[model samples]
Target: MKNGFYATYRSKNKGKDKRSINLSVFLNSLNHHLQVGSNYLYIHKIDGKTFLFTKTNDKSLVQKINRSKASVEDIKNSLADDESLGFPSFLFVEGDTIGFARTVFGPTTSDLTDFLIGKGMSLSSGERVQIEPLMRGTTKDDVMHMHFIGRTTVKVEAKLPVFGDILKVLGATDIEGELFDSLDIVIKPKFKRDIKKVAKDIIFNPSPQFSDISLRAKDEAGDLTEHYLSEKGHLSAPLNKVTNAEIAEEMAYCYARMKSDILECFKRQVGKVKD
Candidate 1:
């Protein structure tokens, strides 16, 4: 993977020519720090008036720029003046774009993982199991890692509801007995629906498969392996183009309904047992 860094330029008052010069200066400074021939640099116009320059290098120039705590102007000057140093630079003539880019680099790799985990976006044990088959014997380990991370984010929304339903059923009065006896039946169908929902959006309205005994057997086998295998028939195509927030909301709705169903079932069972 290339170590890439991006810098943007924004100006409300400057003409296009002046803005372009400012951007050019920023790019030159970055190129100088990246030692020119050692890296690739390209400037992209994000909008009609604003621009972004991306520089990729094997050296850790991007990391150095990110680690520096200097003010934007100070950083820009440092990059412009330091002939021997390789550092990424951005010149923003106007607005807060420079500040925004600086803030974006605040998180380290571990920090990003921790942030996602805090937001309930981390991979579950079940998901890690599902990914292992896809990754077996692949030369593209990095690609697989990215693929699993993306899929985990995609499936997490669907997984949340299933977990919530399991908890609800387990906590309910007489529903606990029914859930324990037919936990597979009760949870598997809901799981299937959720998977289908994810599949439909990702696979362009694919047809749904019915749950079967073989699937139940797979779940049973997977249970021994302690991997949360979907009782759903086939694996859905990897989710693409779905927003994280949308998935989370859909999962929340599914869980809320499951919780209500468990409560209703509990009430009915309690009444019957009393009678």
Candidate 2:
């Protein structure tokens, strides 16, 4: 996430566009996802002001840091040598800024779903069904297999821990906890059975017709978006609600499709590409 470069602009009586500065420093917002841990930093310069950037799924971390009332120099120094501070770090030197750059790197995970969800994006119905299969598979046998019956069916064993982690990241533990506790009272056993049957139907007949139905339901809930998938297969929608089952599902599907496509590509190039 961080890179190194030089800038030559002095901080003084000058007006400069911040967006231009940001664009010069970071080439793309996608770089934010590549940044993880507390070590990475983003640095840029505009007119004379230096801007530091860092990405966090947790807003509380931002509030806490801002509340510390730390001076810019103090922040810069703290982040300079230490890399295990448990949060993203940024440093901007005060003065005329010319050209500048910095090195960035961080821990990587497939948990981008949690990151996106924390940002308030919603998912479509088809997406929700796609993720169900991924949540349950820690072992090989738990992996959902496609069936050739009336339709393809997938079984997902939800990873309760991942859900909990996501809730904690979003600071929704209380609400999630309450919902879990209220599940016995609010969700009828018969309804649960019916829901399972519906899930089976979705897995088996994942056609555009069914996808359209799911999308309509999500739209009725006010969760549709104009954003399309990125080259990385990520849905580029902003978050809105605290819990977006539809968005999670879309992410799951996107990840699955990306994997499937990659595998297919490999199969095609089996005798061509070198290891």
Candidate 3:
């Protein structure tokens, strides 16, 4: 089934980060402001660069990402081709990457008949076929729920029911517990704001790579909740590909198109904040 999704933009350069530059313009013109500037805004380096900055979701994205060459049917086929099999439960994945966005639960070794190649011919010739198995099979073998965290690259086009900018910053801090507790990644406002600036600096400017300029800041709750904008493409192509640049122009393009619904959504959200 086709899923839905959402998105946003960034900018920079001319001695500034391109994404930030592009994003500032888009952020300003969208005509939607949810929160006021934060005096608490601060910055710090998380990791130097481990793909910490990129416009689309490479199965990771803007606030998250964009699309491939086709639509629903094509996307569905790209995922579940007849010849493909599961990340098959008996297997393990290390560095191998491709089609990470697809689902193994749909067909990943879930059936006994799935193993049969040319229809069972063993019983005709050999009655001696060993029925004795080493272990008893249970019905609970194939239950699965796989979550693939890939990246994305969303377009400025009104391609989704909701398409716009989002500020997503997530972190966790150390926590100690009696039974089973491990240090956790903490989510904070300043951390998220810092990330928003980083993304703006890196993506929102101008050049050859891409466009989409948007901005985000902290809500009162340090609300880093990521509202998914769309689904069709989320489960579409894998996200290890795609950028920001000449970001201003692209951001302009995005705003020209998306300024309506997305802007309205934000307006409503801001109104809620006001309320």
Candidate 4:
């Protein structure tokens, strides 16, 4: 299999007018530091530490490759020619509730979703696919790392009967600084229709879905608006100025940014190695 590192590095730097000459030099230094460990795994040193990259050619990840029109041998022959095919598979569990892409470095989640949907998988009502682009990592010491990319700000109408619950429950708490100030900001004027009146059938709360929580509140004009948190922790507003699909696309952009940021991070580490 090809090294797969140089090509990726070149592709990332191709169009930029001001080139990173140090990175060009760092590649050679990286080569000097590279070590071949077990089959397929290429190890390298970074600041007295180790990092590695490996690629797979497993056919099971293709998901029913022979069951489809393509024969097992046909797919096997193709895999022999490509070095990076295995890293882009869409990961899934057997039960079929959650699925996510292995890497955002290649195809966007949207493209993978469309491709899978195009492949004729059936979905029951309320069962739909959604993408969340939150990626987690670790510091050099193995402490957990996360990036807060986006958020949804919610304002609770103070007039809803639930408003008293919010105040009573939250205000009763001992923490009384920024918590109270932030709460004060979210409590807004009440709308015309009461949420309790609209949701009369419910004793506790309605069943919630990750994508469509389906909770609603009424406006002065008698129109109802949705208000619920998505499985990805996005709180929905009335008109939903940005739809879920748009947020997924935006997350794709974040994925793109993240991949490049990681690349740049490696470049910085490699540059330091030269010094």
Tens-digit lDDT track of model 2 for 128-241: 201111111111111123111121222111233434544567786454443441110011233212232443354334241121111001112223111111222112222223
What range of 10 consecutive residues in model 4 has the weakest lDDT sum? 1-10
Predicted structure with the largest lDDT when compared to the true one = 4
Q: For each predicted model, how many residue pairs clash, with residues at least 3 apart or on different chains?
A: 2, 36, 76, 0
RMSD of each: 21.1, 21.4, 26.8, 21.5
Off by over 4 Å in 4: 1-87, 97-101, 122-128, 131-275
* Minimal lDDT window, size 10, model 1: 129-138
Q: All models: lDDT?
A: 0.26, 0.27, 0.21, 0.27
* lDDT-superior candidate, 3 or 4: 4
- Candidate 4 lDDT over 1-275, as tens digits, reads 01011111111122221122222123224321111131122212111111112233344533332244433233323331132233322222111111232232323444434433443334444444333222222111111111111111232333334445556776753433334322222222254423342232221234321121222333243243222222233211111243223333433432332333324333442222211
Cα displacement (angstroms), candidate 1, residue 274, comes to: 32
Write model 3 residue lDDT over 1-275, tens digit each, in one string: 11111221111122121111121222223211111122011011111110011011122211111222233233222322221211111111111100111223222211211211112212222221111111111111110111111121223332321222121122323312233211111223442234433333333333312222222322243232222222122222322222111211222332333344343433343211110
User: Candidate 1: TM-score?
Assistant: 0.18
lDDT per residue as tens, model 1, 1-275 = 11111122221222121121132233333322212455533332222222233345645655565456334334222322132122222212221112111112222223222322333332423331000011111112122222111111112122334434555767843333423312223224443232333422332223322111111111111221111122231112122343222222332332232332323322332211111
Candidate 1 displacement at residue 134 in angstroms: 20
TM-score of each: 0.18, 0.20, 0.17, 0.21
